[PDB]
DNA sequence: GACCCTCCCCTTAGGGGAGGGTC
DNA sequence: GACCCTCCCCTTAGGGGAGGGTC
């Protein structure tokens, strides 16, 4: 009243950066009442300070500045609706996070399983919770020529639903007394889901289906072309010896141990199978 | 296996932009296995595709890329903890929104009151819910020289707690048969709070206190220097006529109607007072 | 001494464009 | 024809810096 405010003065009492203000001047969001054409100084009336209440608030909810310009104009009738807009926008940014917390929280649950694990190369027998998965016909792939490009479509579907990618790759094959590895080929190959959001439009060549709750003879180890077969052998034997009775395929699960493109690639296999 | 992937090829099956990949090459986050020194083409092995699982996932939770570099290196023991990091980070980005939804939702509740309001210039008598506020000693300000710079400290406190600014300015003064306006000066001046988050460190010269639930003779109108006094008059009269009995100060509340720096400034006053 | 000014280079994570050179 | 390349200008909302000119 009866004098102007310098930008310092405004900044201080309005709690807003000098550089901030200058920018708002620049974009024609908030201009000083008067610019000294001699010194180019910016001066501000007490009246206009009120405009900042909005600019501040709108900022704190993080609406864009170009958006604020369209905002300040409209009067209350509409300003309400606008807020109601933000309100919904929030509730969704909020539904999105609430998803993540769950996803991460489960993804974690699954790494712990990997780490805290009885012992390698031996055949543990244990009780497992069910695991939801997306499957597909193997169309004659084997461990010899399987290839993670082979997973692309499943991945496209998972990532659209989970936003995470599967951090394990699976296949299944019939339990036989296999005498070689070239003897074996996969039946239907698969990857775990984490989310219950619909797969947007599932084609009839994926299959949503599960690895069921039940008793599993399973062996787990780090990968090497050689050990792969030999550990499988341990398994076949373990059953035959104990005269156990299988009721599924063998489920095989490849998991990376690090994603560093610098250390030499290292994978952890798990091969499970259901028995009574 | 036994051939490379072109960037197109990778992009398609990994569902990631060609431009995206090129960038990851540029930052040394994800390099092609091999660059043709003749054509500068980028070629990729099937092996390395696995690195994208992380890069993709990490992206979807929106960790920075420079941060991803530090991530891929560490092995599971730590990768867990890292996630546990994100987990907490989310829960807070989430506590922040959950605040907003509430804040906006109440801020809205209060605009509706403004709009849906019985009638202007007349004296309505009504029942009011309590309103929490921050007060301060008026130190001799009147409607004549009051000035919204006068509000700066309260605002600094509110904005630190609510993140919104008060979109109304208040004062109180003693109920007298005032014969002029120069006769009047404010007692303790104030602004509404919306949040229950502590004011970080409140100085002993603010006061958290309320406008209490109770019966209010109140009049509301658009502002003009002139009407201000005259509407107040209506009020004093209304009481005196009905022989009512006041139990508070008059509470006065200035609210902007638009924040457009283009339309001429327009404010809505409300003056309330408590009676039995 | 304290305050304000106008350039000017920078920070994410790429998208959209030329304009060649190869599939 | 289809695919890939390397510059190059751009998008938020300013912060941090010169290097003058005024308080
Ligand atoms: C990515 C991947 C997935 C498999 N299931 C696999 C099996 C045997 C050997 C190499 C393999 N690679
Ligand atoms: C910002 C503001 C706040 C008030 N309470 C007020 C009172 C009378 C006249 C002008 C005023 N301006």
Coordinates of C-alpha atoms (C1' of nucleotides) and ligand atoms in Angstrom, one line a residue:
Chain A
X1 CA 0.0 0.0 0.0
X2 CA 1.5 3.3 -1.3
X3 CA 4.9 1.7 -2.1
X4 CA 6.2 -1.3 -4.1
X5 CA 7.8 -4.6 -3.0
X6 CA 11.3 -5.5 -4.4
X7 CA 11.7 -9.1 -5.4
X8 CA 13.7 -9.8 -2.3
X9 CA 11.0 -8.4 -0.2
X10 CA 8.4 -10.6 -1.9
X11 CA 10.5 -13.7 -2.0
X12 CA 11.1 -13.5 1.7
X13 CA 7.6 -12.9 2.9
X14 CA 5.9 -15.1 0.3
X15 CA 8.5 -17.8 0.8
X16 CA 9.3 -18.2 -2.9
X17 CA 12.7 -18.1 -4.7
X18 CA 13.8 -14.9 -6.4
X19 CA 14.8 -17.1 -9.4
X20 CA 11.3 -18.6 -9.1
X21 CA 9.6 -15.3 -9.4
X22 CA 11.7 -14.2 -12.3
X23 CA 10.7 -17.3 -14.1
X24 CA 7.0 -16.6 -13.4
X25 CA 7.5 -13.2 -14.8
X26 CA 9.1 -14.8 -17.9
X27 CA 6.2 -17.2 -18.6
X28 CA 3.5 -14.6 -17.9
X29 CA 2.2 -16.5 -15.0
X30 CA 3.0 -13.8 -12.4
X31 CA 4.3 -10.4 -13.5
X32 CA 5.5 -7.6 -11.2
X33 CA 3.1 -4.7 -11.0
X34 CA 5.9 -2.5 -12.4
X35 CA 9.3 -2.8 -14.0
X36 CA 11.7 0.1 -13.6
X37 CA 12.6 0.9 -17.2
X38 CA 15.9 2.3 -15.9
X39 CA 17.2 -0.5 -13.8
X40 CA 14.9 -3.3 -15.0
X41 CA 14.1 -4.0 -11.3
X42 CA 11.0 -5.8 -10.5
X43 CA 8.4 -4.2 -8.1
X44 CA 5.3 -5.8 -6.7
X45 CA 2.1 -4.4 -5.1
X46 CA 0.7 -5.9 -2.0
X47 CA -2.6 -6.6 -3.8
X48 CA -1.2 -9.1 -6.2
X49 CA 0.4 -11.2 -3.4
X50 CA -2.9 -13.0 -3.3
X51 CA -2.3 -14.5 -6.7
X52 CA 0.5 -16.6 -5.2
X53 CA -1.8 -18.4 -2.8
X54 CA -3.0 -20.3 -5.8
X55 CA 0.3 -20.5 -7.6
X56 CA 1.8 -21.9 -4.4
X57 CA -1.1 -24.3 -3.7
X58 CA -1.2 -25.5 -7.3
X59 CA 2.5 -26.1 -7.2
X60 CA 2.3 -28.1 -4.1
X61 CA -0.1 -30.5 -5.8
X62 CA 2.3 -30.4 -8.8
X63 CA 0.1 -29.1 -11.5
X64 CA 2.2 -27.8 -14.4
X65 CA 2.7 -24.0 -14.9
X66 CA 1.2 -23.8 -18.3
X67 CA -1.8 -25.5 -16.6
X68 CA -1.9 -22.9 -13.8
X69 CA -2.4 -20.2 -16.3
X70 CA -5.6 -21.8 -17.5
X71 CA -6.5 -22.3 -13.9
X72 CA -6.3 -18.8 -12.3
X73 CA -8.8 -17.4 -14.8
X74 CA -11.8 -19.6 -14.1
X75 CA -14.0 -18.7 -11.1
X76 CA -15.2 -20.9 -8.2
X77 CA -18.0 -22.7 -10.0
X78 CA -15.3 -24.3 -12.2
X79 CA -12.4 -24.2 -9.8
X80 CA -14.2 -26.8 -7.8
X81 CA -14.5 -29.1 -10.8
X82 CA -10.8 -28.6 -11.6
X83 CA -9.9 -29.7 -8.1
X84 CA -12.2 -32.6 -8.5
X85 CA -10.1 -33.4 -11.5
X86 CA -6.9 -33.4 -9.5
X87 CA -8.7 -35.4 -6.9
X88 CA -9.2 -38.3 -9.3
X89 CA -5.7 -37.9 -10.8
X90 CA -4.2 -38.3 -7.3
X91 CA -6.5 -41.4 -6.5
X92 CA -5.0 -43.0 -9.5
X93 CA -1.3 -42.1 -9.0
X94 CA -2.3 -43.6 -5.6
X95 CA -3.8 -46.8 -7.0
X96 CA -0.5 -47.1 -9.0
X97 CA 1.7 -47.0 -6.0
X98 CA -0.5 -49.2 -3.9
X99 CA 0.0 -51.8 -6.7
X100 CA 3.8 -51.4 -6.5
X101 CA 4.1 -51.9 -2.7
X102 CA 2.2 -55.2 -3.2
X103 CA 4.3 -56.2 -6.3
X104 CA 7.7 -55.4 -4.7
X105 CA 6.5 -57.0 -1.5
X106 CA 5.8 -60.3 -3.2
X107 CA 8.8 -60.1 -5.5
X108 CA 10.9 -59.8 -2.3
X109 CA 9.1 -62.8 -0.7
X110 CA 10.5 -64.8 -3.7
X111 CA 14.1 -63.8 -3.5
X112 CA 14.2 -64.8 0.2
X113 CA 13.1 -68.3 -0.9
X114 CA 16.1 -68.4 -3.3
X115 CA 18.7 -67.3 -0.7
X116 CA 17.4 -69.1 2.4
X117 CA 17.4 -72.5 0.8
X118 CA 18.4 -75.8 2.6
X119 CA 21.3 -76.9 0.4
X120 CA 22.5 -77.1 -3.2
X121 CA 22.9 -80.2 -5.4
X122 CA 21.1 -82.4 -2.9
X123 CA 17.4 -83.4 -3.3
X124 CA 15.2 -81.6 -0.8
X125 CA 11.5 -82.6 -0.5
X126 CA 9.1 -79.9 0.6
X127 CA 5.6 -78.4 0.7
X128 CA 4.9 -75.5 -1.6
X129 CA 2.3 -72.9 -2.0
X130 CA 0.8 -72.6 -5.5
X131 CA 2.4 -70.4 -8.1
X132 CA 0.4 -68.6 -10.8
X133 CA 1.9 -68.7 -14.2
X134 CA 1.4 -68.1 -18.0
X135 CA 2.2 -71.0 -20.2
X136 CA 2.6 -71.8 -23.8
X137 CA 3.1 -74.8 -26.1
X138 CA 6.9 -75.5 -26.3
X139 CA 6.6 -76.3 -30.0
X140 CA 9.6 -78.6 -29.7
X141 CA 12.2 -76.6 -27.9
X142 CA 14.8 -78.3 -25.7
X143 CA 17.3 -77.2 -23.1
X144 CA 19.8 -77.4 -25.9
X145 CA 18.2 -74.8 -28.2
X146 CA 15.9 -72.9 -25.8
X147 CA 16.6 -69.3 -25.9
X148 CA 15.2 -66.4 -23.9
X149 CA 14.0 -64.7 -27.0
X150 CA 11.7 -67.7 -26.8
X151 CA 10.0 -65.9 -23.9
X152 CA 9.2 -62.6 -25.6
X153 CA 5.4 -62.9 -26.0
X154 CA 4.9 -64.1 -22.4
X155 CA 7.0 -61.3 -21.3
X156 CA 5.0 -58.8 -23.3
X157 CA 1.9 -60.1 -21.5
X158 CA 3.4 -60.1 -18.0
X159 CA 4.9 -56.7 -18.3
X160 CA 1.6 -55.2 -19.5
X161 CA 0.0 -56.6 -16.3
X162 CA 2.7 -56.5 -13.7
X163 CA 4.9 -53.8 -15.0
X164 CA 7.7 -55.9 -13.6
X165 CA 9.3 -58.5 -15.7
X166 CA 9.5 -62.2 -14.6
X167 CA 12.8 -62.6 -12.9
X168 CA 12.6 -66.3 -13.5
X169 CA 12.1 -68.4 -16.7
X170 CA 10.3 -71.8 -16.5
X171 CA 9.7 -74.9 -18.5
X172 CA 8.2 -78.3 -17.9
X173 CA 8.9 -81.7 -19.5
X174 CA 7.8 -85.3 -19.0
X175 CA 9.4 -87.3 -16.2
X176 CA 11.3 -90.1 -18.0
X177 CA 14.4 -92.2 -17.3
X178 CA 16.3 -89.9 -19.8
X179 CA 19.6 -91.5 -20.7
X180 CA 20.8 -88.4 -22.6
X181 CA 20.0 -84.6 -22.7
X182 CA 19.4 -84.7 -26.4
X183 CA 16.7 -87.2 -25.5
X184 CA 14.6 -84.4 -23.9
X185 CA 12.3 -81.7 -25.1
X186 CA 10.0 -79.3 -23.2
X187 CA 6.2 -79.6 -23.2
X188 CA 4.8 -76.2 -22.4
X189 CA 7.1 -73.3 -21.2
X190 CA 6.1 -70.6 -18.8
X191 CA 6.7 -67.6 -16.6
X192 CA 5.3 -66.6 -13.2
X193 CA 2.7 -63.8 -12.8
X194 CA 2.6 -61.6 -9.7
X195 CA -0.4 -59.4 -10.4
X196 CA -4.1 -60.0 -10.6
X197 CA -4.8 -57.2 -13.0
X198 CA -6.3 -58.8 -16.2
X199 CA -3.9 -59.5 -19.0
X200 CA -5.2 -56.8 -21.3
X201 CA -6.4 -59.1 -24.1
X202 CA -5.0 -62.6 -23.7
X203 CA -4.6 -64.6 -26.9
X204 CA -5.8 -68.2 -26.9
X205 CA -2.3 -69.5 -27.1
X206 CA -1.2 -68.4 -23.6
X207 CA -2.7 -70.3 -20.8
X208 CA -3.2 -68.9 -17.3
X209 CA -2.6 -71.9 -15.1
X210 CA -0.8 -72.9 -12.0
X211 CA 2.0 -74.9 -10.2
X212 CA -0.3 -76.4 -7.5
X213 CA 0.0 -76.5 -3.7
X214 CA 1.5 -80.0 -3.0
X215 CA 4.6 -82.0 -2.1
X216 CA 7.7 -81.4 -4.2
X217 CA 10.8 -83.4 -4.7
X218 CA 13.1 -80.6 -5.8
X219 CA 16.8 -80.1 -6.4
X220 CA 18.5 -76.7 -6.8
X221 CA 21.9 -75.6 -8.1
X222 CA 23.9 -73.1 -10.0
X223 CA 23.8 -73.7 -13.8
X224 CA 26.3 -75.4 -16.0
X225 CA 25.6 -77.3 -19.2
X226 CA 27.0 -80.4 -17.5
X227 CA 25.5 -80.3 -14.0
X228 CA 22.1 -79.7 -15.5
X229 CA 21.8 -83.3 -16.7
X230 CA 23.6 -84.8 -13.8
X231 CA 21.5 -83.0 -11.1
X232 CA 18.4 -84.1 -13.0
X233 CA 19.8 -87.6 -12.6
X234 CA 20.0 -87.3 -8.9
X235 CA 16.3 -86.5 -9.0
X236 CA 15.1 -89.4 -11.1
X237 CA 17.1 -91.6 -8.8
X238 CA 15.8 -90.1 -5.6
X239 CA 12.3 -91.0 -6.7
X240 CA 13.1 -94.5 -8.0
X241 CA 15.0 -95.3 -4.8
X242 CA 12.2 -94.1 -2.4
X243 CA 9.7 -95.7 -4.8
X244 CA 7.8 -92.4 -4.7
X245 CA 5.1 -91.5 -7.2
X246 CA 5.2 -88.5 -9.5
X247 CA 2.0 -86.7 -10.4
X248 CA 3.3 -83.8 -12.5
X249 CA 5.9 -82.8 -15.0
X250 CA 9.2 -81.7 -13.8
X251 CA 9.1 -78.0 -13.5
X252 CA 12.3 -76.3 -14.3
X253 CA 13.1 -72.7 -13.2
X254 CA 16.1 -70.6 -14.4
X255 CA 16.9 -67.5 -12.3
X256 CA 19.7 -64.9 -12.8
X257 CA 21.9 -64.3 -9.8
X258 CA 23.2 -60.9 -10.9
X259 CA 22.3 -58.7 -13.8
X260 CA 25.7 -57.1 -14.0
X261 CA 26.8 -57.0 -17.6
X262 CA 30.3 -57.2 -16.3
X263 CA 30.5 -60.3 -14.1
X264 CA 30.3 -63.6 -15.9
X265 CA 26.7 -64.8 -16.4
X266 CA 25.4 -67.0 -13.6
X267 CA 22.0 -68.7 -13.3
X268 CA 20.4 -70.7 -10.6
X269 CA 18.2 -73.7 -11.7
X270 CA 15.5 -75.3 -9.6
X271 CA 13.9 -78.5 -10.8
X272 CA 10.7 -79.5 -8.8
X273 CA 8.3 -82.3 -9.2
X274 CA 5.0 -83.3 -7.5
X275 CA 4.5 -86.5 -5.6
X276 CA 1.9 -87.6 -3.0
Chain B
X1 CA 22.8 -68.1 -30.3
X2 CA 25.2 -68.2 -33.2
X3 CA 24.0 -64.9 -34.7
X4 CA 23.4 -61.3 -33.4
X5 CA 20.3 -59.3 -32.9
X6 CA 19.9 -55.9 -34.7
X7 CA 18.5 -53.1 -32.6
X8 CA 15.1 -53.4 -34.4
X9 CA 15.0 -57.1 -33.5
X10 CA 15.8 -56.4 -29.9
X11 CA 13.5 -53.5 -29.6
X12 CA 10.6 -55.5 -30.9
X13 CA 10.9 -58.6 -28.8
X14 CA 12.1 -56.8 -25.7
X15 CA 9.5 -54.2 -26.1
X16 CA 11.8 -51.2 -25.7
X17 CA 12.4 -48.2 -28.0
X18 CA 15.2 -48.2 -30.4
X19 CA 16.0 -44.7 -29.3
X20 CA 15.8 -46.0 -25.8
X21 CA 18.4 -48.6 -26.5
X22 CA 20.7 -46.2 -28.2
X23 CA 20.5 -44.0 -25.0
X24 CA 21.4 -47.0 -22.8
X25 CA 24.4 -47.6 -25.0
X26 CA 25.3 -43.9 -24.7
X27 CA 25.2 -44.0 -20.8
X28 CA 27.0 -47.3 -20.5
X29 CA 24.0 -48.9 -18.9
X30 CA 23.3 -51.4 -21.7
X31 CA 25.8 -51.8 -24.5
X32 CA 25.4 -54.0 -27.6
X33 CA 27.6 -57.1 -27.6
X34 CA 29.2 -55.8 -30.8
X35 CA 29.3 -52.7 -32.9
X36 CA 30.1 -53.1 -36.6
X37 CA 33.1 -50.7 -37.0
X38 CA 32.0 -50.3 -40.7
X39 CA 28.4 -49.4 -40.4
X40 CA 28.3 -48.5 -36.7
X41 CA 25.3 -50.8 -36.5
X42 CA 24.4 -52.2 -33.0
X43 CA 24.2 -56.0 -32.5
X44 CA 23.1 -57.8 -29.4
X45 CA 23.5 -61.4 -28.1
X46 CA 20.6 -63.4 -26.8
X47 CA 22.5 -63.9 -23.5
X48 CA 22.5 -60.2 -22.6
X49 CA 18.7 -59.8 -23.1
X50 CA 18.5 -60.9 -19.4
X51 CA 20.0 -57.6 -18.3
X52 CA 16.9 -55.8 -19.5
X53 CA 14.6 -57.7 -17.1
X54 CA 16.2 -55.5 -14.4
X55 CA 16.5 -52.4 -16.5
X56 CA 12.9 -52.7 -17.4
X57 CA 11.7 -53.5 -13.8
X58 CA 13.8 -50.8 -12.3
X59 CA 12.4 -48.4 -14.8
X60 CA 8.8 -49.3 -14.0
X61 CA 9.3 -48.4 -10.4
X62 CA 11.1 -45.3 -11.7
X63 CA 14.6 -45.5 -10.3
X64 CA 17.0 -43.2 -12.1
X65 CA 19.4 -44.7 -14.7
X66 CA 22.5 -43.6 -13.0
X67 CA 21.0 -45.4 -10.0
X68 CA 20.4 -48.6 -12.1
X69 CA 24.1 -48.8 -12.9
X70 CA 24.9 -49.1 -9.2
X71 CA 22.1 -51.6 -8.9
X72 CA 22.9 -54.3 -11.5
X73 CA 26.3 -54.9 -10.0
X74 CA 25.2 -56.0 -6.5
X75 CA 24.1 -59.6 -5.9
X76 CA 20.9 -60.8 -4.3
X77 CA 22.0 -60.5 -0.6
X78 CA 22.0 -56.7 -1.3
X79 CA 19.4 -56.5 -4.1
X80 CA 16.9 -57.4 -1.5
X81 CA 17.9 -54.5 0.7
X82 CA 17.8 -52.1 -2.2
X83 CA 14.2 -53.1 -3.0
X84 CA 13.4 -52.7 0.7
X85 CA 14.8 -49.2 0.1
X86 CA 12.4 -48.5 -2.7
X87 CA 9.6 -50.1 -0.6
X88 CA 9.9 -47.4 2.0
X89 CA 10.3 -44.7 -0.6
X90 CA 7.1 -45.7 -2.1
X91 CA 5.2 -45.9 1.3
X92 CA 6.2 -42.3 1.7
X93 CA 5.4 -41.0 -1.8
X94 CA 2.2 -42.8 -0.8
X95 CA 1.8 -41.2 2.6
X96 CA 2.2 -37.8 0.8
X97 CA -0.6 -38.4 -1.7
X98 CA -2.9 -39.8 1.0
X99 CA -2.4 -36.5 2.7
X100 CA -3.4 -34.5 -0.5
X101 CA -6.6 -36.4 -1.1
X102 CA -7.6 -35.4 2.4
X103 CA -6.5 -31.8 2.0
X104 CA -8.1 -31.2 -1.3
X105 CA -11.2 -33.1 -0.2
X106 CA -11.6 -30.7 2.8
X107 CA -10.5 -27.6 0.8
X108 CA -13.4 -28.5 -1.6
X109 CA -15.8 -28.9 1.3
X110 CA -15.1 -25.3 2.0
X111 CA -15.6 -23.8 -1.4
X112 CA -19.1 -25.4 -1.6
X113 CA -20.0 -23.6 1.6
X114 CA -19.0 -20.3 -0.1
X115 CA -21.1 -20.9 -3.2
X116 CA -24.2 -22.6 -1.8
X117 CA -24.9 -19.8 0.6
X118 CA -28.5 -18.6 1.5
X119 CA -28.2 -15.0 0.4
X120 CA -25.9 -11.9 0.3
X121 CA -26.2 -8.7 2.3
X122 CA -28.9 -10.2 4.5
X123 CA -28.2 -11.6 8.0
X124 CA -28.4 -15.3 8.2
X125 CA -28.3 -17.1 11.6
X126 CA -26.9 -20.6 11.5
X127 CA -25.1 -23.5 13.2
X128 CA -21.5 -24.0 12.5
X129 CA -18.9 -26.7 12.9
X130 CA -15.7 -25.7 14.6
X131 CA -12.8 -24.3 12.6
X132 CA -9.2 -24.7 13.6
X133 CA -7.0 -21.7 13.1
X134 CA -3.7 -20.0 13.8
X135 CA -3.9 -16.7 15.5
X136 CA -1.6 -13.8 16.4
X137 CA -1.8 -10.5 18.2
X138 CA -3.1 -7.8 15.9
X139 CA -0.7 -5.2 17.3
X140 CA -3.0 -2.4 16.4
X141 CA -4.0 -3.2 12.8
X142 CA -7.3 -2.1 11.4
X143 CA -9.3 -2.8 8.3
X144 CA -7.9 0.5 7.1
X145 CA -4.3 -0.4 7.2
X146 CA -4.4 -4.2 7.3
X147 CA -2.4 -5.7 4.6
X148 CA -1.9 -9.3 3.5
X149 CA 1.9 -9.0 3.9
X150 CA 0.6 -8.8 7.5
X151 CA -0.1 -12.5 7.1
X152 CA 3.3 -13.8 6.0
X153 CA 4.4 -15.5 9.2
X154 CA 1.1 -17.4 9.7
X155 CA 1.3 -18.4 6.1
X156 CA 4.9 -19.6 6.5
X157 CA 3.6 -21.9 9.3
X158 CA 0.5 -23.1 7.5
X159 CA 2.3 -23.9 4.3
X160 CA 4.9 -25.8 6.1
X161 CA 2.2 -28.0 7.6
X162 CA -0.6 -28.1 4.9
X163 CA 1.5 -27.4 1.8
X164 CA -1.6 -25.5 0.7
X165 CA -1.9 -21.9 1.5
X166 CA -5.0 -20.6 3.4
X167 CA -7.4 -19.4 0.8
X168 CA -9.1 -17.2 3.4
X169 CA -7.7 -14.4 5.7
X170 CA -9.3 -13.7 9.0
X171 CA -9.5 -11.2 11.8
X172 CA -11.5 -10.7 14.9
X173 CA -12.5 -7.5 16.7
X174 CA -14.6 -6.5 19.7
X175 CA -18.4 -6.2 19.1
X176 CA -19.2 -2.5 19.8
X177 CA -21.8 0.0 18.5
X178 CA -19.1 1.4 16.2
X179 CA -20.1 4.7 14.8
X180 CA -17.2 4.9 12.3
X181 CA -14.7 2.5 10.7
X182 CA -11.7 4.5 12.0
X183 CA -13.2 3.7 15.4
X184 CA -12.2 0.0 14.9
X185 CA -9.0 -2.0 15.3
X186 CA -8.5 -5.8 15.2
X187 CA -7.8 -7.9 18.3
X188 CA -5.9 -11.0 17.1
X189 CA -5.8 -11.9 13.4
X190 CA -5.8 -15.5 12.0
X191 CA -5.9 -18.1 9.3
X192 CA -7.6 -21.5 9.1
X193 CA -5.5 -24.7 9.2
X194 CA -6.5 -27.9 7.3
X195 CA -3.9 -30.4 8.5
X196 CA -3.1 -32.1 11.7
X197 CA 0.6 -32.5 11.0
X198 CA 2.4 -30.6 13.7
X199 CA 3.5 -27.1 12.8
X200 CA 7.2 -27.9 12.7
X201 CA 8.4 -25.6 15.5
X202 CA 5.7 -23.2 16.5
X203 CA 6.8 -19.9 18.1
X204 CA 5.0 -18.7 21.3
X205 CA 3.5 -15.9 19.4
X206 CA 1.2 -17.9 17.2
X207 CA -1.7 -19.5 18.9
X208 CA -3.4 -22.7 17.8
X209 CA -7.0 -22.2 18.7
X210 CA -10.5 -22.4 17.3
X211 CA -13.7 -20.8 16.0
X212 CA -16.1 -23.0 18.2
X213 CA -19.2 -25.1 17.3
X214 CA -22.1 -22.8 18.1
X215 CA -24.8 -20.4 16.8
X216 CA -23.7 -17.7 14.5
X217 CA -25.3 -14.5 13.4
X218 CA -23.5 -13.9 10.2
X219 CA -23.7 -11.7 7.1
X220 CA -21.8 -12.3 3.8
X221 CA -21.2 -10.1 0.8
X222 CA -18.7 -9.1 -1.9
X223 CA -16.2 -6.5 -0.7
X224 CA -16.1 -2.8 -1.1
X225 CA -14.6 -0.2 1.2
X226 CA -18.1 1.2 1.7
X227 CA -20.3 -1.9 2.1
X228 CA -17.9 -3.2 4.6
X229 CA -19.0 -0.9 7.3
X230 CA -22.6 -0.8 6.2
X231 CA -23.0 -4.5 6.2
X232 CA -21.4 -4.6 9.7
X233 CA -24.2 -2.2 10.7
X234 CA -26.9 -4.5 9.6
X235 CA -25.3 -7.0 11.9
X236 CA -25.1 -4.9 15.0
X237 CA -28.7 -3.9 14.4
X238 CA -29.9 -7.5 13.9
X239 CA -28.6 -8.4 17.3
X240 CA -29.9 -5.3 19.1
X241 CA -33.3 -5.7 17.5
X242 CA -33.7 -9.3 18.4
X243 CA -32.1 -8.6 21.8
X244 CA -29.8 -11.5 21.2
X245 CA -26.6 -12.0 23.2
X246 CA -23.1 -12.2 21.8
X247 CA -20.5 -14.5 23.3
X248 CA -17.6 -14.0 21.0
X249 CA -15.8 -11.4 18.9
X250 CA -17.0 -10.8 15.4
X251 CA -15.0 -13.0 13.2
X252 CA -14.2 -11.6 9.8
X253 CA -13.1 -13.7 6.8
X254 CA -11.8 -12.3 3.5
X255 CA -11.8 -14.8 0.5
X256 CA -10.7 -14.2 -3.1
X257 CA -13.2 -15.1 -5.8
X258 CA -10.7 -15.4 -8.6
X259 CA -7.0 -15.4 -8.7
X260 CA -6.8 -14.1 -12.3
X261 CA -4.3 -11.3 -12.4
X262 CA -6.4 -10.0 -15.3
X263 CA -9.9 -9.5 -13.9
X264 CA -10.4 -6.8 -11.4
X265 CA -9.7 -7.9 -7.8
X266 CA -12.8 -9.3 -6.1
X267 CA -13.1 -10.5 -2.5
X268 CA -16.0 -12.1 -0.5
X269 CA -16.3 -11.1 3.1
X270 CA -18.1 -13.0 5.8
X271 CA -18.6 -11.6 9.3
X272 CA -19.8 -14.1 11.9
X273 CA -20.5 -13.8 15.6
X274 CA -21.5 -16.2 18.3
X275 CA -24.7 -16.0 20.3
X276 CA -26.6 -18.5 22.5
Chain C
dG1 C1' 28.3 -3.9 1.8
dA2 C1' 23.6 -5.7 0.3
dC3 C1' 20.5 -6.3 -3.6
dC4 C1' 18.9 -7.1 -8.5
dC5 C1' 19.9 -7.4 -13.3
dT6 C1' 20.7 -10.4 -17.7
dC7 C1' 22.7 -14.0 -20.1
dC8 C1' 24.6 -18.7 -20.1
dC9 C1' 25.5 -23.8 -19.2
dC10 C1' 22.9 -27.7 -16.7
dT11 C1' 19.6 -31.8 -15.1
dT12 C1' 15.9 -36.8 -17.1
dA13 C1' 15.2 -39.7 -20.3
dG14 C1' 14.5 -39.9 -24.2
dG15 C1' 10.9 -38.5 -28.9
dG16 C1' 10.8 -36.4 -33.3
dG17 C1' 13.0 -34.8 -36.7
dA18 C1' 16.2 -34.0 -40.6
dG19 C1' 19.6 -36.2 -44.1
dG20 C1' 22.7 -40.0 -45.6
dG21 C1' 24.3 -45.0 -46.1
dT22 C1' 22.7 -50.1 -46.0
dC23 C1' 19.4 -53.8 -46.8
Chain D
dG1 C1' 11.5 -50.6 -50.0
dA2 C1' 12.8 -51.5 -44.9
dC3 C1' 16.3 -50.6 -41.4
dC4 C1' 20.0 -48.1 -38.8
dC5 C1' 23.3 -44.4 -38.3
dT6 C1' 24.7 -39.6 -36.2
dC7 C1' 23.9 -35.1 -35.2
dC8 C1' 20.6 -31.5 -33.6
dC9 C1' 16.7 -28.8 -31.5
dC10 C1' 13.2 -29.7 -27.6
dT11 C1' 10.5 -30.5 -22.8
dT12 C1' 10.0 -28.8 -16.5
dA13 C1' 11.0 -25.7 -13.6
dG14 C1' 14.1 -23.6 -12.1
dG15 C1' 19.5 -23.6 -9.3
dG16 C1' 24.1 -22.0 -9.6
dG17 C1' 27.0 -19.5 -11.7
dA18 C1' 29.6 -15.7 -13.8
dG19 C1' 30.1 -10.4 -14.4
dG20 C1' 28.2 -5.7 -14.1
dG21 C1' 25.2 -1.7 -12.2
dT22 C1' 22.6 0.0 -7.8
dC23 C1' 21.9 0.5 -2.9
Ligands
LIG1 C1 17.2 -68.4 -20.7 C2 17.3 -69.9 -20.6 C3 16.2 -70.6 -20.1 C4 16.3 -72.0 -19.9 N1 15.2 -72.7 -19.5 C5 17.5 -72.7 -20.3 C6 17.6 -74.1 -20.2 C7 18.8 -74.7 -20.4 C8 19.8 -74.1 -20.9 C9 19.7 -72.7 -21.1 C10 18.5 -72.0 -20.9 N2 18.4 -70.6 -21.0
LIG2 C1 -6.0 -8.9 2.5 C2 -7.0 -8.2 3.3 C3 -7.5 -8.8 4.5 C4 -8.5 -8.1 5.3 N1 -8.9 -8.6 6.4 C5 -8.9 -6.7 4.9 C6 -9.8 -6.0 5.6 C7 -10.3 -4.8 5.1 C8 -9.9 -4.3 4.0 C9 -8.9 -5.0 3.3 C10 -8.4 -6.2 3.7 N2 -7.5 -6.9 3.0

